[PDB]
């Protein structure tokens, strides 16, 4: 079967510089008419894919200049002469060659380097609501920050936690290229009520020292 | 201008079946090939199958007897009949307008217009619909609350604040898979502290997957 190879699989780019993703097919897209049928979609967050270049090298309707494609032939390479945060998604290579069957590639992931950014920190107790169904959560949100690295510590009447908290992190975001993040910790009714001090303690690069918000039950 | 919609992805069976409708709006697409494109967990873009203007078909390797793709053009409609699901074939399902039938040597502009997608879930575990508990804005600038939509299945669930109105600020995160295998999620906004007591925020959730509709009112305790 015809396959398809993208690299790199992700790259991080500073607004402003360039981005270069390379798309290899196993045989030739080339046919007789001179044409070469390999197109290029992006996936933003939360949108279905869009068509960026048609037949290797041809920038579809509404897509900027600062798009272009080039290659023949098995190699091809999307160049975005300057990145903008607005990017920031999957980019997948596609050939056409078998139309009307179709082959993607496996899609490269491109991120956007900023400036550090620190989060801002939350803590929320669990709700009357919650706690008579005999769970406990305790959420801690890290709102928009950069780098994506970030270390999230749960404690307990300051005893430290393990095993029983899970994280989500946002996609970056397309407008100010930063990530929130949500740790929640999960107790027992019993558990929860056995102890006062709940606190968060947030270790991030654009902060002075560790972070820790807290509350009393 | 043409509009694709999907429908019909739901959870199923393995083994089960189920029909996918794409319907087109605008123009005809009776002309255009039509394409079948899954994804799995938001990353991945997989082929799947396809129909030309004349009713000819096309799969991959991976669901050929098991797929069958039709059309309907009084309808301007593709329709995608699966057969013996497995979970493997759990992802996002679009619908994509291809160039027209025959015409690819001489007229091909690329893959330009896909459906929003529409998702399958092959598992044999329940429908559960979600609980939504309050996210209270802290009695201590800019504040932060939300809601936390905990123990649901399947995916997705969407949520929206105050009918729409307010955007800026929103955070609703991915869902996250519990130990259970039931998924949660939360959904947060950060609003001017001094608004806290004069404006009101209610979380708005769907679990269309179970009929579940929750306005939540989230006020400082």
């Known amino acids: 079967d015809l396959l398809m190879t993208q690299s790199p699989h992700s790259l991080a780019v500073t607004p402003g510089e360039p981005a270069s993703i390379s798309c290899r097919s196993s045989?030739?897209?080339?046919?007789?008419?001179?044409?070469?049928?390999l197109d290029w979609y992006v996936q933003k967050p939360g949108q279905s894919p869009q068509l960026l270049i048609y037949?290797?090298?041809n920038r579809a309707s509404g897509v900027p200049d600062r798009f272009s494609g080039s290659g023949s032939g098995t190699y091809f390479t999307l160049k975005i002469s300057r990145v903008e945060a607005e990017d920031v998604g999957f980019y997948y290579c596609?050939?056409?060659?078998?139309?009307?069957?179709?082959?993607f590639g496996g899609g490269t992931k491109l991120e956007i380097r900023r400036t550090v950014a620190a989060p801002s920190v939350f803590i929320f107790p669990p709700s009357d609501e919650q706690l008579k169904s005999g769970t406990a959560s305790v959420v801690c949100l890290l709102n928009n920050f950069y780098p994506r690295e970030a270390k999230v510590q749960w404690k307990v009447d300051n005893a430290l936690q393990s095993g029983n908290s899970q994280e989500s992190v946002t996609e970056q975001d397309s407008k100010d290229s930063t990530y929130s993040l949500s740790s929640t910790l999960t107790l027992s009714k019993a558990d929860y009520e056995k102890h006062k001090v709940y606190a968060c303690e947030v270790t991030h690069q654009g902060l002075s020292s560790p972070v820790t918000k807290s509350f009393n039950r | 201008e043409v509009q694709l919609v999907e429908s019909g992805g739901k959870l199923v069976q393995p083994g089960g079946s189920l029909r996918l409708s794409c319907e087109a709006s605008?123009?005809?697409?009776?002309?255009?090939?039509m394409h079948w494109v899954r994804q799995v967990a938001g990353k991945g873009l997989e082929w799947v199958s396809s129909?030309?203007?004349?009713?000819?078909?096309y799969y991959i390797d991976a669901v050929k007897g098991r797929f069958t793709v039709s059309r309907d053009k009084g309808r301007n409609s593709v329709y995608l009949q699966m057969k013996t699901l497995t979970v493997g074939d759990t992802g996002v399902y679009f619908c994509?307008?291809?160039?027209?039938?025959?015409?690819?040597?001489?007229?091909?502009w690329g893959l330009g217009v896909w459906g929003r997608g529409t998702t399958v879930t092959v598992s044999s575990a329940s429908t559960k619909g979600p609980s939504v508990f309050p996210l209270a804005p802290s009695s201590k600038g800019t504040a932060a609350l939300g809601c936390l939509v905990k123990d649901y299945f399947p995916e997705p669930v969407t949520v929206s604040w105050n009918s729409g109105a307010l955007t800026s600020g929103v955070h609703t995160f991915p869902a996250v898979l519990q130990s259970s295998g039931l998924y949660s999620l939360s959904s947060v906004v950060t609003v001017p502290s001094s608004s806290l007591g004069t404006q009101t925020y209610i979380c708005n959730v769907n679990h269309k997957p179970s009929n579940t509709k929750v306005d939540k009112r989230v006020e400082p305790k």
């Open positions: 994509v307008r291809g160039p027209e039938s025959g015409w690819f040597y001489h007229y091909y």
């Open positions: 605008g123009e005809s697409v009776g002309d255009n090939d």
């Open positions: 129909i030309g203007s004349s009713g000819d078909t």
């Open positions: 045989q030739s897209l080339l046919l007789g008419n001179g044409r070469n049928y």
């Open positions: 037949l290797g090298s």
């Open positions: 596609m050939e056409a060659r078998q139309t009307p069957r179709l082959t």
